[model samples]
Target chain A: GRVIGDVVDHFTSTVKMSVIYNSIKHVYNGHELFPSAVTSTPRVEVHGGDMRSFFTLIMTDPDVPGPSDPYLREHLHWIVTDIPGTTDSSFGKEVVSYEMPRPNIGIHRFVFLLFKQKKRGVVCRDGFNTRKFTQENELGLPVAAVFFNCQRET
Target chain B: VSSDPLVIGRVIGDVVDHFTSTVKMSVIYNSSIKHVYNGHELFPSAVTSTPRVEVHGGDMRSFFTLIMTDPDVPGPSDPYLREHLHWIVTDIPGTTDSSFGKEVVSYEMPRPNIGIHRFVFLLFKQKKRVVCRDGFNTRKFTQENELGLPVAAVFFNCQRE
Candidate 1:
């Protein structure tokens, strides 16, 4: 079964910064690195939901290429995973948690998404630590996808 | 909820498995030189070398290096050439004899013996988790080797090896 809650219900304020944060530039040594705007309420709730795992993702821009530096380092703003599939009301409903984070330091827009993937890949063993992926960590690192072959014969 | 979700988490881009130079592990060379009888032999002397790369939990396929020549004729036409040194990046962490494309690269040297040719070998554990070369050509690789970028070759020796 899945248990749903808001961003405020699960993690420390430090990590929440990562959620609402639009750029790595905004935080330095655990402080606001850039002049920014805070989306009123960043959180989620699966209606009629009952699953073992769930997630709340944040995506800035999906079109830009990597070197996700500066403000344009836009792409999956957030990817919350390990959600146990639940909620019979298939069509997801998102409440306007808050006025979108404006392009404050100059037109920087952010987008947040919530999804339930088929599975959460090899977590710890693959180098993803339990710190942020914890019942504590919020929308931690995602597993990579690269083609490789492994087999043995004589 | 920020206006952008990508920069933070929504659609995770390429999840790269980083492998730095620190975690460098063992390098095993399972190779040999094909000996030539004399100046009347028919086959070109052959040599091969291989290496295994690793850093953090990330790994990469091994690469090959070759050092083969004929001293008798001092060039490609030498009938019985003695291939002195060689290396082939074979048996990567993952690959079959049929699918060596996954880990190995083959190189054939320009046959010549006595001249101002500079023979060099390098072992590099670069930041990029990929093994690349200068157009897979010795002449071009030598150029890149000089620049010392994208390649960190070590344990190099000369004198036709």
Candidate 2:
């Protein structure tokens, strides 16, 4: 859908990922979530692989300011690297500290992209190009991904 | 010219004028699980207690007012009581929700016996702390209080089950 064209290219989802915020589990169906519900970093679980298999997790917002004119698209919300397979994000190196989603206007897509890292270490700011970053870091198409829609509280 | 659900539901014309939403307001019920969105359907039993309304803005000095009205009172077809004020709160500080605001009018749970009714929550950035009736004219009250256009507005539908 929007994530495919806006963020990354199509690829098989070989990895399983789960994102939980305040005890609520989130999937990739573009479910609507309030900014209040995601004020804190979510509990992320990555399935498959082993300790030797490391992954990178990226949280970005494809819609900035408003959906109609998202000039500042793909805003980076959080980034973590070196996460071992079969473990949660807490077991990874937090390359970019988590910045809670605060969508001031319109419905924003908060996407979580997981890539099977050949190695560790990857990279920020609100205007991030997911495809470029992935290609630059040699992190091929996402192994798994999930996204949720959020808007200004009222 | 706005594409917000309020416009589609005629809340812009029926309740207030067209204005930009500068402030962020959130209405949550059932301890924050249930959220209020424009045109979302909520049952009467589900809203017995006042929903948690959080207003986000710039300064701590900036206060706001919250008003809840039922535009489809009595009946949507011929609502003699066009605008029924369900609740009114004043002097709500920025970054805080309705719980911290001064309750000028206690919340009256929606009980729509006739048909599906629209219950709207309107938030206005207050110039200062201010003070309404059941047969409320939302437009008139805004002008009288000099509150200007609402910074944020949301509504939900409810019907008898």
Candidate 3:
């Protein structure tokens, strides 16, 4: 029904996520804006099963280089690991700094994904390596995912 | 073929129904060269300030029409003002920039105070150079009805700061 549903089609389980900044919870209704709104990383809360459960989060841009010509497909933007359930992404180890998007040509979409780790203390070889992370890791389906769009200053 | 980013970003469903990219177009501002709507934000006023746009086709004499709109006016959940037109230009010859064309709709910058929004740009091919004087309503806009199937199209995302 959503972008996550179309890309991560095989996942059956779901994890709840809420993007918040200064107490304002971001609703994914396709509103547009500039980088001024995202100077500081927003707080993301995740809820899957229990406190013992761990999670890994990944941020990517499926539209890279250009919408018409996507040479850099599924570009990795951010990553975090070892986040316990019922906690937030900050609880995990920071693997990548959240880089603000500045699309030059057309509108761009930023996607966030949360995956349930097969075991605790899952070490990441490289966070920004999206294809490798998804292919090599034994993590199950994504527990949660969210997206938003951005573009160059008109 | 359908693009995964278009499907993942919901651009394919929200504004564009379907089409194949036939021409190459580029939008630029500051130093950013938009690949696929860079997945971030830009100030409303800055976005309102027209950016650099370039286009190309098989030949230089090709005429093109460009339409920009936001399908998620208020929000994706309730887009009563869906596809509020942002900008429009016509009779643009290929191998040239937007300045070479006629400005149909000036430009309206996006100010999405609520959630994320989809900003779609659709490009159409024209058989000949023509002047566009009619007001366009994005509510019932269709490529087949207005200009014909678009030869190319692109889209991006945005939100309020």
Ranking by lDDT: 2, 3, 1
Tell me the tens digit of each residue's lDDT in model 3 across B11-99: 66665665566887877655244444534555554564566667867467777888887767446786654555668888888888788
Q: Is model 1 an incorrect, acceptable, medium or high docking prediction? A: incorrect
**Tens digit of per-residue lDDT, candidate 1, span B1-161:** 34322223211121111212322222222344332221112222232333333212224463322212122222223312222223334222321221232334444332233322222233332222222221123334434444222122222112232
| lDDT tens per residue, model 1, A52-90 | 544344333221221233322332223443433343212
Candidate 3: segments with Cα more than 4 A from true spot: A1-154, B1-3, B31-40, B43-46, B130-146
If both were scored by TM-score, which would come out higher, candidate 1 or candidate 2? 2
lDDT at position B70, candidate 3 = 74
lDDT of each: 0.27, 0.80, 0.65
lDDT of 1: 0.27
DockQ of 2: 0.01
In TM-score terms, candidate 3 sits at 0.45
Q: Candidate 3 lDDT, tens digit per residue, A103-141? A: 544677777778888779833211134545666887656
A8-70: candidate 2 lDDT, tens digit per residue? 877777878788877575655668877678877887899887668999899888776568877
Please estimate how well model 3 matches the true structure, expressed as its whole-model Cα lDDT: 0.65
Docking class of 2: incorrect
